[PDB]
Symmetry: D2
Subunit: 161 residues, 4 copies
């Protein structure tokens, strides 16, 4: 009865896979590209969706890291989750489920800490999450800012005097 | 240049994904249904293929178990690997790779121990692997033979006197 | 030459295990109990320590979650990491390593998001991390605030008008 | 009431950890060194023990592999499990449990396929398991026989004519 974000028929909304009546991909207007938006309210501590995708050996812009050498290619859903330094969802890559870390109001962008699942990103980027504590430049957890990132961080540091 | 077993274009034979010039699905003639056959010779201790599929929460006839609550739906390749009590390949479900446990000659069926990756099967079955040490009735590692399996095993045990 | 936090001789500082010349357990003075303090400066994106402990099946106050059914009992080091809603370290429970999520100055408390590795805590607690965005009441990622937590969160919500 | 193989008090026999009234380490008399022996009968498909040990980054003679980069140091129990090419137990390294793959009679040596959990061994060895289908020379699943192993395997192959 409910229509799923994932195109595969075997992934059913009645089993927890995301529905287009609950999640929507939209183009942000603040330089973050496209991202997942929630259309209903979620209390903190609830499973918002089961997650799926295709196994691949290679890190890509729309993969998530499963373990040391294996990634999950999901350009329909979890790969379109935007980053925030203060995230409102956790993507559990062992149970393959998305959970609310806080109360999320309908219409809010869904955000994970990319460094919470990823050793290294496909690309580093300057962060537009707006949080009071923005790392400003976003990497994997096991990844040093590259020389562009170090230069931008230094200009911000001088400004901090 | 080489054509892949997996229909997805993103899975390339040049990156280790199986090619139809190396693997073939055939119908066995001894009651094992269809299964994967190798068309080239492989020395023991080599990676024969990278493995892929679709993440799902549910055990199915053509899934393999990833971890406690997550399975890999692969009806094109790894889900068509037949069982043997003396296996010639290992399916590594952390690196998602198939490795030869022994020298395999071209034309041989590829066989894993289903109990080496699976807690519980979608279905139990009487084993036709022919090995001198056949469990005769095949389950997951964490799965008791059901009452059919116990009855067949008992008739075999009486015969053993 | 360097003395290790972990009592076991097989865990050597020269292999990355924490040294008492780099980490110290101290009693906080703001209601967080004891916690790990760093004694040297760490740039973001560096491995600060290898982690170890004892495998156990049971969640405890000083365990960390490895996977769905397995935890790591470590009362010497990683179990004494305090929580923060804006963490400065990530505890990678697959590689068993601690990594700096930001620049950390010598003397700073080390903090992880408990919800980033834990489904459920041994106990919930009101948070004293001070971050502008404190969840105020801390649970596992897959754990609803209990009735004490809901009552405290509601009093805070009324105050927010 | 029951005394545990693991020296730690926190690992209780009442929670499934092995008891010396069920398991015993003995010196084999056929060139396999010491190994774990079972003292009670176990039907196939039962959990014989919970497993534990110390996390370490390094492969050792008495470690078992957890994931790509992490091993479990257990010289009291699971590291003393001998190898067999036709194993009677599976060591589940995700749930950290030992399960019977077949009916095991009291007094039998417990045997796993080392290649079922290990990419690479600390050392390769000629196999004395006696199975009709012995690989004769034992490696990790992702490990080629070294030049000693290749030489011994070739002498056996000539004998096979
Ligand atoms: C695979 S994407 C997620 C979807 C992507 N925005 C898209 O439009 O297809 C990851 C990329 O999104 C952008 N992005 C995500 N979070 C961001 C943030 N907080 N600030 C700026 N850019 C962000 C970055 O360009 C990053 O490399
Ligand atoms: C998903 S299948 C593998 C592919 C399957 N044969 C097919 O034809 O689609 C697993 C099933 O194959 C059959 N099978 C596999 N190995 C077998 C064996 N050694 N002896 C008998 N049947 C076997 C069993 O019916 C088992 O439930
Ligand atoms: C196992 S402990 C870490 C070490 C512990 N403080 C100790 O003193 O042994 C986890 C507990 O520390 C306390 N704690 C950790 N982070 C905290 C925080 N940010 N605010 C308040 N209490 C915290 C809580 O009581 C929580 O249950
Ligand atoms: C860590 S051990 C297990 C305990 C060891 N036997 C001990 O005595 O401490 C692994 C080693 O045991 C021996 N071993 C285990 N299984 C064997 C087998 N089936 N045949 C010959 N040697 C074996 C090998 O020397 C191998 O390197
Ligand atoms: C949520 S996915 C966009 C994050 C990881 C991805 N491999 C990236 O590089 O951004
Ligand atoms: C190699 S797959 C056929 C084995 C596991 C599968 N879920 C089954 O039930 O047979
Ligand atoms: C960093 S450990 C203190 C967090 C998880 C632990 N099991 C707890 O309950 O707090
Ligand atoms: C059961 S443990 C003895 C097997 C793996 C170990 N690291 C070895 O090298 O034999």
């Amino acid at each position: 009865q409910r229509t799923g974000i994932y195109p595969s028929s075997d992934l059913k909304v009645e089993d927890g896979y995301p529905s287009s009546d609950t999640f929507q991909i939209i183009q942000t207007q603040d330089g973050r590209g496209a991202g997942v938006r929630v259309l209903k309210t979620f209390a903190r501590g609830r499973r918002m969706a089961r997650v799926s995708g295709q196994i691949t050996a290679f890190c890509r812009l729309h993969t998530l890291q499963i373990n040391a050498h294996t990634h999950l290619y999901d350009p329909h859903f979890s790969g379109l989750l935007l980053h925030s330094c203060v995230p409102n969802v956790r993507l559990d890559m062992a149970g393959f489920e998305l959970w609310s870390l806080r109360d999320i109001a309908a219409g809010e962008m869904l955000t994970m800490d990319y460094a919470s699942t990823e050793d290294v990103l496909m690309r580093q980027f300057e962060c537009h999450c707006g949080a009071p504590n923005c790392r400003r430049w976003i990497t994997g957890a096991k990844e040093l800012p590259n020389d562009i990132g170090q230069a931008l961080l230094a200009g911000l540091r001088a400004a901090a005097l």
